Ligand SMILES: [Mg+2]
Ligand SMILES: [Zn+2]
Ligand SMILES: [Zn+2]
């Protein structure tokens with residue numbers, strides 16, 4: 001158990017100063033902030049904790065204000081004394097999710113520098129799939145130590161305390177332990193992170209430098225027009241009511257729009273083959289086949305999609321506007337995916353329909369403030385370009401080199417015809433093949449997406465490999481080393497460990513083989529995107545132009561740029577993204593602008 005004896009609670013300047021002096025001479029030191037809220041832009045700093053050595057840590061409370069709280073160094077005095085050390089790039093700091101701490105300090109005009117080690121990221125790079133990368137999971141895995149949980153000192157549910165209400169010593173145990181454990185975790189993981197120059201490279205030049213840029217993107221937020229979202233909601237209520245009527249009218253009587261309950265009884269009872277359509281889904285969607293002739297499955301399909309969208313973005317988004325900035329601040333997660341891509345929540349920007357009109361209308365609500373425009377910089381089919389490079393295929397490489405549509409270029413080789421004549425159906429077939437290779441899909445899987453018979457899909461796949469021999473060879477070589485070393489790598493050295501690569505279980509080992517082929521392309525896209533963000537952010541920080549980097553979704557970066565600066569800025573973002581990342585993969589950035597994200601997109 002952690003008691004009051006482990007860590008000191010600093011309540012006087014003299015003692016703070018003695019610690020600042022010891023911290024100034026330490027090789028590295030763990031740093032942590034405690035606040036009254038998870039909301040970064042509006043959280044107030046309640047205290048800070050440091051650890052100079054395993055077992056030697058302190059908690060400096062500055063804003064506890066429960067009834068009769070003892071005197072504390074004031075927040076303003078603690079920060080002015082600590083400011084030099086925090087802003088010194090030479091004073092190296094260790095922390096768990098330093099993105100959060102860097103932001104809190106920024107609420108006071110302090111720029112945390114020397115952001116050298118983040119234990120969450122040390123863990124993530126060592127093995128993205130070892131388990132959760134939070135401090136409690138980390139402490140238990142690497143230190144065989146169970147940490148004090150927030151719920152343990154603050155309580156649970158609606159009656160949970162905020163940090164400023166927690167007694168000094170209790171807050172101390174929690175805060176000082178965070179700092180202590182964090183430093184111990186670093187001492188155990190940092191040495192390990194050196195056994196391989198690959199992960200070390202990614203951790204050092206991709207992950208760590210991205211910490212403060214994600215903080216800045218999150219705190220910048222994105223301007224959302226709540227009126228637009230509201231009208232969209234009202235209109236969707238009318239449209240859903242109308243569709244319900246259109247459905248009732250195509251059949252007889254009233255009924256819910258739920259399959260395997262009410263639909264099979266109408267749809268198949270009035271002709272159609274018995275199997276219902278599961279919402280599995282993107283492999284055999286019964287309702288959408290019927291859609292090409294049968295009107296009911298079409299209106300039930302268009303209905304559900306609209307209902308899901310309205311409650312997920314139309315009704316939720318306006319509620320996410322922060323009263324302090326008037327903007328929405330999404331949460332980017334740097335250590336969650338297996339491949340290295342950034343994930344996103346509240347809102348999950350990646351789930352906003354891309355090829356659909358309603359998704360387009362959601363995007364129309366992401367607007368630019370007055371005298372600014374939304375600028376969208378996208379990496380055109382980066383994953384496919386990466387595959388071209390990874391497979392050393394002169395065919396694909398040349399298609400990209402001469403600016404041809406790779407899907408039509410691919411179709412012209414797989415079907416053997418001039419590029420000008422390739423039909424829409426041939427392009428759609430080559431496209432399914434191409435993007436099917438990225439996710440390592442089976443000839444049968446391809447057939448399930450192309451609506452053709454098995455072995456016909458196999459026919460398209462055999463013709464592809466004959467024409468693009470380099471891709472089969474990459475695919476075979478990748479599944480090979482995956483079984484040899486138990487993991488696959490990206491161009492920068494990032495690793496995806498594959499434990500089920502020899503699973504024996506057919507399904508699991510199947511998944512592990514698809515992950516083997518996919519991770520190097522997806523992880524490499526992720527690495528390039530992070531390097532671009534770091535590069536664009538560095539220019540932003542050095543030059544201070546009239547631009548804010550507001551989002552990262554899929555392979556695009558979204559900005560707010562001043563209307564009178566769009567041309568120069570666009571030229572700049574463009575050169576940075578395709579010329580300041582990897583020089584080996586043939587990259588292309590499509591830059592676009594408009595009054596809203598939909599227009600720029
Ligand atoms: Mg913390
Ligand atoms: Zn803490
Ligand atoms: Zn992509």
Ligand SMILES: [Zn+2]
Pocket residue numbers: 574578589
């Ligand atoms: Zn260019």
